[PDB]
Design a binder for this molecule. Structure first.
Ligand SMILES: Nc1nc2c(ncn2[C@@H]2O[C@H](COP(=O)(O)OP(=O)(O)O)[C@@H](O)[C@H]2O)c(=O)[nH]1
Ligand SMILES: [Mg+2]
Lengths: 320, 166
């Protein structure tokens, strides 16, 4: 239909309390991915990316009762992050990573440290050395790209820290962890193990390369969490000097990555046509109408909203 | 001697790492430490047989799919873990099951269903519907707790047998 015709629906999706989006997050399951693509384009269009992502993440946090699990599972919030970062932090990853990864590919010096995965007369001391040097080279490149993260993404990480502080005031460690779990766990390390996510490479890693990428991303992940190796696998123990000597360089990064408190909006999205996505979002409402009726039956702040939703959905049902 | 390549899979934060380490190292780890891919070896004895577990511990995050394919291909048995207080982890179990089936080209692959965190009071996934889903797959279901160690040595050993009976 004419974009004009979705207006009443379009302005119920955007309502600040984000009540509908949460409801949808409960109702979907297999449409998670599809729905995300649809909500992001809608909110990117009237420059509300921040409203969506910031509130949604804040909801997940306020609903989390145990901290060591925060944003670890696959919700809509963590999918919304996923697809947003892949859209806005590509260049970032190329800066930090492209040089270090390409060097690792063309290399033939194996980085293997594991006392069983080892070839015959392979020198594990030579290995350790070479790995460390790559790691040093890489993380220096990672650290000195703090300023390369777009401003609006930095704000949302700020959102994330604001939240964890309001939730766990007595815990000073969370404000960094909660950022690490996205920029490293869900962005940097994946891009390391699989360089085609962002199109850094175009070729399949050699057997030695494939190993080094895991050994490197494992190492980056330990640092990103602030954990020494020791208590888990034994072979990894001699990569700790690196962790100990960069431990604080990491805390800087994760803390200041969210150091933007004012929202950005330049490079703004030009006015074009939304109907295709509004149709497709309505179609996800139809497909989950029954389920959203069950959620509308529960009284509370979202109720009147969820009431109006099914009316609007049904009214747009009729009009097609 | 005889090696078994077990692979531990499930959503993020469900307790695959905690399960494996309570097996390997005999203690409970309560701290933030998301995995990329840690590997442990441990020679044990199950039912008189001296054997060697090569246990792979994986990352559950959707971002690490596709990196899923390689470790599945080499795997022999799969613990498929979820949390009884996290229902969404329970529904994810399906996707691991179907992918594992695809990459190996078979429909009866050595699998065990593990429900972790049963020490918790706040449980949203009932023992029965987990047992139901297990039967409809043709595979055992074990409730474990890495905190207390209940069902842990069970859950891994059961997988070994399940590999032997294949
Ligand atoms: N109460 C309880 N917590 C657990 C159990 N297993 C793991 N945890 C906690 O759940 C969180 C994630 O555990 P972990 O094994 O690292 O998750 P995974 O590696 O992503 O599967 C940590 O805080 C663990 O201590 C369990 O059986 N009971
Ligand atoms: Mg883990």
């Amino acid at each position: 239909m004419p974009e004009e015709e979705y207006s009443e629906f379009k302005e119920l999706i955007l309502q600040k309390e984000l009540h509908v989006v949460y409801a949808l997050s409960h109702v979907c399951g297999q449409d998670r991915t599809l729905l995300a693509s649809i909500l992001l384009r809608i909110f990117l269009h009237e420059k509300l990316e921040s409203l969506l992502l910031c509130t949604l993440n804040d909801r997940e946090i306020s609903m989390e009762d145990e901290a060591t699990t925060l944003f670890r599972a696959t919700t809509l919030a963590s999918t919304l992050m996923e697809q947003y970062m892949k859209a806005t932090a590509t260049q970032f990853v190329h800066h930090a990573l492209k040089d270090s990864i390409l060097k690792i590919m063309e290399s033939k010096q194996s980085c293997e440290l594991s006392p069983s995965k080892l070839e015959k007369n392979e020198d594990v001391n030579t290995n350790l050395t070479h790995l460390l040097n790559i790691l040093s080279e890489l993380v220096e490149k990672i650290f000195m790209a703090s300023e390369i993260l777009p401003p609006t993404l930095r704000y949302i990480y700020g959102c994330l820290q604001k939240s964890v502080q309001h939730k766990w005031p007595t815990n000073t460690t969370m404000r960094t962890r909660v950022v690490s779990g996205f920029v490293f766990l869900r962005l940097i390390c994946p891009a390391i193990l699989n360089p085609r996510m962002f199109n850094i490479i175009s070729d399949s890693p050699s057997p030695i390369a494939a190993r080094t990428l895991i050994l490197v991303a494992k190492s980056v992940q330990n640092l990103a969490n602030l954990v020494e190796f020791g208590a888990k696998e034994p072979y990894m123990e001699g990569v700790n000097p690196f962790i100990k000597s960069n431990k604080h360089r990491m805390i800087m990064f994760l803390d200041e990555l969210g150091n933007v408190p004012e929202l950005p909006d330049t490079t703004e999205h030009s006015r074009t046509d939304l109907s295709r996505d509004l149709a497709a979002l309505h179609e996800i409402c139809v497909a989950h109408s029954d389920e959203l009726r069950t959620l509308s039956n529960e009284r509370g702040a979202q109720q009147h909203v969820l009431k109006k939703l099914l009316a609007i959905t049904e009214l747009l049902q009729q009009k097609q | 001697m005889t090696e078994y390549k077990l692979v531990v899979v499930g959503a993020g934060g469900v307790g695959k790492s905690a399960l494996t380490i309570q097996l390997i190292q005999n203690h409970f780890v309560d701290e933030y430490d998301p995995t990329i891919e840690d590997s442990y070896r441990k020679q044990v004895v199950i039912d008189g047989e001296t054997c060697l577990l090569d246990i792979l511990d994986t990352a559950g995050q959707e971002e690490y799919s596709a990196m899923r394919d390689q470790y599945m291909r080499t795997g022999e048995g799969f613990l498929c873990v979820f949390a009884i207080n996290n229902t969404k982890s329970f529904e994810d179990i399906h996707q691991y099951r179907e992918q594992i089936k695809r990459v190996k080209d078979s429909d009866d692959v050595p699998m065990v269903l593990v429900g972790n965190k049963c020490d918790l009071a706040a449980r949203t996934v009932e023992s029965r519907q987990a047992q139901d889903l297990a039967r409809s797959y043709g595979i055992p279901y074990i409730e474990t707790s890495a905190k207390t160690r209940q069902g842990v040595e069970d859950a891994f050993y059961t997988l070994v047998r399940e590999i032997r009976q294949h």
